[PDB]
Short mmCIF file of C-alpha atoms and ligand atoms in Angstrom, two decimals:
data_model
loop_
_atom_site.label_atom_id
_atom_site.label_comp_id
_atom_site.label_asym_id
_atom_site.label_seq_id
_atom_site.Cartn_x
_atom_site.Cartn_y
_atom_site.Cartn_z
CA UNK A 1 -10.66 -22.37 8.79
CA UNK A 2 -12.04 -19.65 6.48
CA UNK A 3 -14.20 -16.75 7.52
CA UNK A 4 -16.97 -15.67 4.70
CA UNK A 5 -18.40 -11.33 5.46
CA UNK A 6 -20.64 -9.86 2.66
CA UNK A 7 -19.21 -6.53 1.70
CA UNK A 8 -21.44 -3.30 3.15
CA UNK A 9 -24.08 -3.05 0.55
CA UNK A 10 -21.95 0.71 -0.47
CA UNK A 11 -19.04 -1.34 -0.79
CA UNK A 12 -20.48 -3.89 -3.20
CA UNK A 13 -21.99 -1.00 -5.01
CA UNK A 14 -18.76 0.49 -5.51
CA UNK A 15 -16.68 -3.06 -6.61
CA UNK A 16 -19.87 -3.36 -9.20
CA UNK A 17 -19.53 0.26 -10.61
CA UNK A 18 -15.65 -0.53 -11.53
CA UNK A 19 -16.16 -3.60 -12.54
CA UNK A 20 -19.64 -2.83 -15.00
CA UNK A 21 -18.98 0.95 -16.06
CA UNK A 22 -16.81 1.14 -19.26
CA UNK A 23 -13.34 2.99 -18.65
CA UNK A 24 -10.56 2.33 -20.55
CA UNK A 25 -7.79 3.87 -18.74
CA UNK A 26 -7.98 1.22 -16.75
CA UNK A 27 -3.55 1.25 -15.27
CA UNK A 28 -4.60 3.43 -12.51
CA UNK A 29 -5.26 0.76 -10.62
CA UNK A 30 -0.84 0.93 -10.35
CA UNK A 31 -0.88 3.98 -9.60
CA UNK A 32 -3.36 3.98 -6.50
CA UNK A 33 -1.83 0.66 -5.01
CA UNK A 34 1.29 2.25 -5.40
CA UNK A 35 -0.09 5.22 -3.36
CA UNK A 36 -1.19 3.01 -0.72
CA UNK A 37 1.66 1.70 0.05
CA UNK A 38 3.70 4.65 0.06
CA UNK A 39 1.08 5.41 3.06
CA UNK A 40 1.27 2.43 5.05
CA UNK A 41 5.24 2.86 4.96
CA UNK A 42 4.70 6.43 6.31
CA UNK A 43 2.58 5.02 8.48
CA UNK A 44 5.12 2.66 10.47
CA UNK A 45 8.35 5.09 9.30
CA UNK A 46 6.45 7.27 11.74
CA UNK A 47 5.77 5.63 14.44
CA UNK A 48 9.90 3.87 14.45
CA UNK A 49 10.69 7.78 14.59
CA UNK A 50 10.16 7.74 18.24
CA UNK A 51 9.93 3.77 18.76
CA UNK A 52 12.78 2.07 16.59
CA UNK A 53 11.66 -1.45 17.72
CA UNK A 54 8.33 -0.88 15.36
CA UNK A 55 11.21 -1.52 12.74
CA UNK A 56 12.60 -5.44 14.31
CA UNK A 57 10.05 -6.82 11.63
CA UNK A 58 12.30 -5.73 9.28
CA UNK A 59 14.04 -1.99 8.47
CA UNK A 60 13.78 -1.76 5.22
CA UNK A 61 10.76 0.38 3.57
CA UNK A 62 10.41 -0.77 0.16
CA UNK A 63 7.97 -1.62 -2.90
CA UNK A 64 8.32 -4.66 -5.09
CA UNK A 65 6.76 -4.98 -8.38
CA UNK A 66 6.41 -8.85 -8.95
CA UNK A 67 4.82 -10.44 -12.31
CA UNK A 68 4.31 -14.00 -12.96
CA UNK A 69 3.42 -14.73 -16.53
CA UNK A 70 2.92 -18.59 -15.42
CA UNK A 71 -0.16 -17.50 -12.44
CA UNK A 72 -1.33 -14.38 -14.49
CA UNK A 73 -0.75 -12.28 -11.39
CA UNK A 74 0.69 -9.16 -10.62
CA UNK A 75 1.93 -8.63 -7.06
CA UNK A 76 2.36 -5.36 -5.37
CA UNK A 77 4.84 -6.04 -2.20
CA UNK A 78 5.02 -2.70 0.40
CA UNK A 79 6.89 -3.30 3.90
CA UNK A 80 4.41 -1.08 5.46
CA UNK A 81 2.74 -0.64 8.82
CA UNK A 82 0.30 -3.64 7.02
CA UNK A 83 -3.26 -4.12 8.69
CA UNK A 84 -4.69 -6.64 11.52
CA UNK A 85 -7.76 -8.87 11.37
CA UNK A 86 -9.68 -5.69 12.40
CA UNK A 87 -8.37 -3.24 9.88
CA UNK A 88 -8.79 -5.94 6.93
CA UNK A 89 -12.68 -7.03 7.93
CA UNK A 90 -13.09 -3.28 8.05
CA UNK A 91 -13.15 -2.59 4.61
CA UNK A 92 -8.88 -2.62 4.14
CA UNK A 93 -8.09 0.03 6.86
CA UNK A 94 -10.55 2.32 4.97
CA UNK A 95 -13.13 5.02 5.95
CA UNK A 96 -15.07 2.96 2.72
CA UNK A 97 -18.36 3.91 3.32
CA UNK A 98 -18.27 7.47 3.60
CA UNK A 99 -15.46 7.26 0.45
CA UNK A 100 -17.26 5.75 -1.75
CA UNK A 101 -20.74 8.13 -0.50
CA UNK A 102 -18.08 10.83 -1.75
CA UNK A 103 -16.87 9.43 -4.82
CA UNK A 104 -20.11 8.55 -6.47
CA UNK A 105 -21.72 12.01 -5.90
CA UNK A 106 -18.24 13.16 -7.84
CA UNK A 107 -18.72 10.46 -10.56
CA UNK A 108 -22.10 12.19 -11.34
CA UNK A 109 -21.04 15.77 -11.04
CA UNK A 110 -18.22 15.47 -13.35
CA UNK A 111 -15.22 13.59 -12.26
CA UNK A 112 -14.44 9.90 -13.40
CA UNK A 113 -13.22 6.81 -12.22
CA UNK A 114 -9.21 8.20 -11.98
CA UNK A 115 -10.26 10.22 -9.22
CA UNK A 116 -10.82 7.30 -7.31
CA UNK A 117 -8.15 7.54 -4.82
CA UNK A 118 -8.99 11.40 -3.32
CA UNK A 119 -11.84 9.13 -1.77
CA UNK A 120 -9.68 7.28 0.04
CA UNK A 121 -11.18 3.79 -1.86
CA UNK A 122 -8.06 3.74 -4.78
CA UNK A 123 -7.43 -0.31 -3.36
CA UNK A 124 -10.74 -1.23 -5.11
CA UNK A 125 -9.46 0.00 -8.42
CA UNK A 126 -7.65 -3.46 -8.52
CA UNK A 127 -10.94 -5.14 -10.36
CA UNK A 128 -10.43 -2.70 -12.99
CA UNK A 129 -8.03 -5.27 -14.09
CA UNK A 130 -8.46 -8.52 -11.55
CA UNK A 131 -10.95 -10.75 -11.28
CA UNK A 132 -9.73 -11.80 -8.08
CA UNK A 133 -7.48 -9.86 -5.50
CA UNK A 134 -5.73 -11.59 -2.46
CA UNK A 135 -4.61 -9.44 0.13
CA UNK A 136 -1.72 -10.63 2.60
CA UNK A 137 -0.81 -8.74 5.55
CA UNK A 138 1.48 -8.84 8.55
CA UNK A 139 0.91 -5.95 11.17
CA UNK A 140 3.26 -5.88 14.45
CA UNK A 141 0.07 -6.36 16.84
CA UNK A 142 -1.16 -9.30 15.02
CA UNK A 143 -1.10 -12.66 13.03
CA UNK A 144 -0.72 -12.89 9.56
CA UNK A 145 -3.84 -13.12 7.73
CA UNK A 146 -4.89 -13.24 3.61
CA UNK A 147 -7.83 -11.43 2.58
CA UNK A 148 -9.68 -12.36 -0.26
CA UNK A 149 -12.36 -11.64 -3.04
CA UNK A 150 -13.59 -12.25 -6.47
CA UNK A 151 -16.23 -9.61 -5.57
CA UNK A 152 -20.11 -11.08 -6.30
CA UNK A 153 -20.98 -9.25 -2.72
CA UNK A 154 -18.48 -11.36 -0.77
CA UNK A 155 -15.11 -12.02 0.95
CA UNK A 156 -12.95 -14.17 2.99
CA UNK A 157 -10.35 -14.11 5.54
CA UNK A 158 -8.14 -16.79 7.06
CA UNK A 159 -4.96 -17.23 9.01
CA UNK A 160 -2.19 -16.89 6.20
CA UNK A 161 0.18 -20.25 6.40
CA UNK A 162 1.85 -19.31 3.62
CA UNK A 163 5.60 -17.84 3.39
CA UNK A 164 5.88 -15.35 6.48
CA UNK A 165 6.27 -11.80 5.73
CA UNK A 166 8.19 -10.25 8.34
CA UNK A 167 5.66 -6.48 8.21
CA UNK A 168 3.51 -5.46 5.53
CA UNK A 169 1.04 -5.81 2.70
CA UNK A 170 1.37 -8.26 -0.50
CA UNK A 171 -1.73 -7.12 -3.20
CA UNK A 172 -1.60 -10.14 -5.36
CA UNK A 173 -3.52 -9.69 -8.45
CA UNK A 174 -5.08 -12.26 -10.08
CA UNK A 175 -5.53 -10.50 -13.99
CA UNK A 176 -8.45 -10.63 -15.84
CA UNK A 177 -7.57 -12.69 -19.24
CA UNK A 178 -7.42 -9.26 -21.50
CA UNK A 179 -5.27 -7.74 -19.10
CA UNK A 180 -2.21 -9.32 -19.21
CA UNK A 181 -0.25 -6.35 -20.86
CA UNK A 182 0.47 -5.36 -16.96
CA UNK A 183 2.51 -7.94 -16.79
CA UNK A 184 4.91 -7.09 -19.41
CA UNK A 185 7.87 -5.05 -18.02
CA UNK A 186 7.89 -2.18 -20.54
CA UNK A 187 4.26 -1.33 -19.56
CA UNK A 188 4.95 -1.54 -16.05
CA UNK A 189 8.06 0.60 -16.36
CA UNK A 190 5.78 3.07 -18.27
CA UNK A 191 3.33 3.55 -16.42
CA UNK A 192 5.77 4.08 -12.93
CA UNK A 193 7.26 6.78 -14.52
CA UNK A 194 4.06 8.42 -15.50
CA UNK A 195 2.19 8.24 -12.42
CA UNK A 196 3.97 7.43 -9.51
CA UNK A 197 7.90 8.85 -10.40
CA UNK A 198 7.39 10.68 -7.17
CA UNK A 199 6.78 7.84 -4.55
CA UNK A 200 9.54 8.51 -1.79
CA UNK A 201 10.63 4.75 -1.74
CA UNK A 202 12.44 2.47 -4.14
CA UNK A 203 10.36 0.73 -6.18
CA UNK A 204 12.04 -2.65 -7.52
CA UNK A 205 10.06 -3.71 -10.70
CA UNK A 206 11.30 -7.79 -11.02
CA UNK A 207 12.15 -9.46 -13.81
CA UNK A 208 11.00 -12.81 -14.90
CA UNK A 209 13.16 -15.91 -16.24
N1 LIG B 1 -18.17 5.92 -7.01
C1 LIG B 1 -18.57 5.47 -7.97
C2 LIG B 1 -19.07 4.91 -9.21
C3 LIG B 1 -17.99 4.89 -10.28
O1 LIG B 1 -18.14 5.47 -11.35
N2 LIG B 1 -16.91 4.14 -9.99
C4 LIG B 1 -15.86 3.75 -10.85
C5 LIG B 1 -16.15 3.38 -12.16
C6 LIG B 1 -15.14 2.99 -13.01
C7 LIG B 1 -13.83 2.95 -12.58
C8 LIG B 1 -13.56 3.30 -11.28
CL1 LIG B 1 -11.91 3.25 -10.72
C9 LIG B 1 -14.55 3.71 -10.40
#
């Protein structure tokens, strides 16, 4: 059973604007995943501070790096608070509307499309370099549940059957076929330690056979 939502009109008019606008620095879109899941793993490090049950869906607070040459995806694996049905349907846990109001008066008064994440919209830089994104999460007051979208004004969600995560959020990015350099572990490598050599969790880039 799949569930089909068009995006808010300002959310499709954001997805578009990456997608469409020509921008080469296009690994940011590491960078700001990253960032969001060192956030949701604040997020439910927090709330185990005075609740350490919140951490029986696992204790470990982690990111995984995961390419598959064979699928053409990239997956970004965080053991963070992760999102219910609600938080996904609502635009990813994000304040998107008002974000992306915010960023686009930016885009013409200067900035550019790096600056994405201040605007609290950084997940959407993934179709700088996907053509489809699937989103699976596992919060601790609900089911787990895979968003998805190839953009074109729409997305799904459904009950996730897949293999059970435990608590968090897999990103699995499904790469455009010009983008498959961020898949190849001395890019990846590079561009951790460029942008994101600060993120307060271990960040476990694996290898492929
Ligand atoms: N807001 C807004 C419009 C805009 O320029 N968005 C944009 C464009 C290219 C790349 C990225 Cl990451 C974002």
């Amino acid at each position: 059973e799949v569930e089909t939502f068009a995006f808010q009109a300002e959310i499709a008019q954001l997805m578009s604007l990456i997608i469409n606008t020509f921008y080469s620095n296009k690994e940011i879109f590491l960078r700001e995943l990253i960032s969001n899941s060192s956030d949701a793993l604040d997020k439910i490090r927090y709330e185990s501070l005075t609740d350490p049950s919140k951490l029986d869906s696992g204790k470990e607070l982690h990111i995984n790096l995961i390419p598959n040459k064979q699928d053409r995806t990239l997956t970004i694996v965080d053991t963070g608070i992760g999102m219910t049905k609600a938080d996904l349907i609502n635009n990813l846990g994000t304040i998107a509307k008002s974000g992306t109001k915010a960023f686009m008066e930016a885009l013409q008064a200067g900035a550019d499309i790096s600056m994405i994440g201040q605007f609290g919209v950084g997940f959407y830089s993934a179709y700088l370099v996907a053509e489809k994104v699937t989103v699976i999460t596992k919060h601790n007051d609900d089911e787990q549940y895979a968003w998805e979208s190839s953009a074109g004004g729409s997305f799904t969600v459904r009950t996730d059957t897949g293999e059970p995560m435990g608590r968090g959020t897999k990103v699995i990015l499904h790469l455009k076929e010009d983008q498959t350099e961020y898949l190849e572990e001395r890019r990846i490598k590079e561009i951790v330690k460029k942008h994101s050599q600060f993120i307060g969790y271990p960040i476990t880039l694996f290898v492929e056979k």
